[PDB]
Design a protein around this ligand. Structure first.
Ligand SMILES: Nc1ncnc2c1ncn2[C@@H]1O[C@H](COP(=O)(O)OP(=O)(O)NP(=O)(O)O)[C@@H](O)[C@H]1O
Ligand SMILES: [Mg+2]
Length: 389
């Protein structure tokens, strides 16, 4: 009755890695939809499989991680291309490829030649962030995410090129069948993961129903738009070959409030910090205040991850609340706010592989960060006007 599992089998049956492995209710699930020429983020009020969405997220965050890694270097990431068609999902970025070289330690473990890209995609607890410094702002940390994508794929293809060679490897049947790679001369330089998720095993129709396809496409498109606001000014995000031109927190705030509060005022702030490493990482904020909003909502893209819980939100709310109480007293406080926060925060710790919640001392923000007075004052004026009416 006491059994010992390997990683691969454990990931196929345990929700702790990527979330639930069939369809459940996902609070706050959103996608983006096109109405004429406008992008509108709308709720998806249907149950979906968290682990399936995490396949896509793990690849997307790997690409944004590489963009951040290369941003200060000669060879930068200039594009991230995300595609979803006929159930096939792919994510490709340029910048330096995954090194095409024998990995000595993995080759000894496996007792055959193993190259670095196979370590990256097929070995659990393996990657370039195992000994991550506290000031690294990549989302990736565990050396797990890409293997979760592979373990939930009926077939997958890793393709990477380093400017001298190209490496193509099939990783099939939920990590059961790793085919030897094909290595050829090449002048290209990129990393591409293409895969077909195990949709039916995760609760979906075979093939996806019209509604499943539409919901998943909308979810991926919104995730791509979130990426576009996070990456550097030299990087374009594409979804199904078309650019996601939501490159500012203001554009994100408009997309989330277009139906509920069109033609609204967008309060903006860049929250800056007083010393390295924090001072390297300004946080971009855009907020809308409306009496039509029924509860506080945030969208936080932190270290490229869509974070649903963190003390950075609490810092903003408490600071606004203090000023609202004062201004209101001269003649709850956050229930009319929708706010977008995008940027990097050094030193955060995620509570699980899913990276739903970040962990930090609240005093980090009190000590180091300053919210601009103009933003606080304008937000307070709008909130108090509502409270008086
Ligand atoms: N798109 C990519 N471009 C370049 N390098 C990549 C890419 N995807 C993955 N890698 C490399 O492959 C390694 C393994 O990826 P992954 O399994 O996702 O672990 P991780 O991103 O380091 N940590 P985590 O995602 O938190 O489990 C990464 O550490 C990178 O070095
Ligand atoms: Mg990763």
């Amino acid at each position: 009755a006491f059994e010992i599992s390997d990683f691969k089998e454990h990931a196929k049956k345990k929700s702790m890695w990527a979330g639930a492995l069939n369809k459940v209710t996902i609070s706050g699930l959103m996608g983006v939809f096109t109405e004429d020429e406008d992008l509108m983020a709308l709720p998806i009020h249907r149950d979906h499989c968290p682990a399936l969405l995490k396949i896509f997220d793990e690849l997307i965050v790997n690409a944004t991680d590489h963009e951040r890694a290369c941003h200060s270097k000669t060879k930068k990431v200039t594009y991230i291309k995300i595609s979803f068609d006929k159930g096939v999902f792919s994510c490709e970025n340029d910048g330096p490829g995954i090194p095409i070289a024998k990995h000595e330690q993995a080759s000894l473990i496996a007792k055959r030649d193993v190259y670095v890209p196979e370590v990256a995609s097929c070995f659990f607890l393996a990657g370039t962030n195992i000994n991550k410094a506290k000031d690294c702002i990549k989302g990736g940390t565990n050396g797990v995410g890409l293997k979760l994508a592979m373990v939930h794929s009926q077939w997958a293809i890793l393709t990477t090129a380093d400017g001298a060679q190209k490496y193509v490897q099939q990783i099939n049947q939920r990590l059961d069948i790793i085919e030897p790679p094909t290595i050829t001369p090449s002048r290209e330089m990129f990393t591409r993961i293409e895969l077909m998720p195990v949709y039916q095993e995760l609760g979906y129709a075979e093939p996806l129903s019209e509604t499943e396809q539409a919901d998943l496409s909308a979810w991926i498109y919104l995730r791509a738009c979130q990426c576009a606001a996070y990456v550097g000014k030299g990087t374009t995000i594409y979804y199904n070959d078309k650019p996601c031109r939501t490159g500012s927190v203001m554009a994100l705030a408009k997309m989330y409030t277009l139906l509920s509060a069109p033609n609204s005022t967008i309060h903006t702030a860049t929250i800056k910090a007083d010393a390295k490493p924090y001072s390297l990482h300004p946080l971009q904020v855009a907020a809308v205040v409306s009496p039509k909003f029924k509860k506080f909502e945030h969208v936080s893209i932190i270290n490229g991850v869509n974070c649903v819980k963190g003390e950075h939100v609490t810092f903003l709310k408490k600071t606004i609340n203090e000023m609202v109480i004062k201004k209101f007293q001269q003649t709850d406080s956050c229930s009319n706010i929708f706010v977008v926060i995008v940027g990097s925060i050094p030193g955060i710790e995620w509570t699980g592989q899913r990276k739903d919640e970040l962990s930090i001392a609240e005093n980090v923000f009190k000590t180091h960060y300053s919210i601009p007075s103009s933003f606080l004052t304008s937000m307070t004026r709008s909130i108090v006007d509502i409270l008086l009416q």
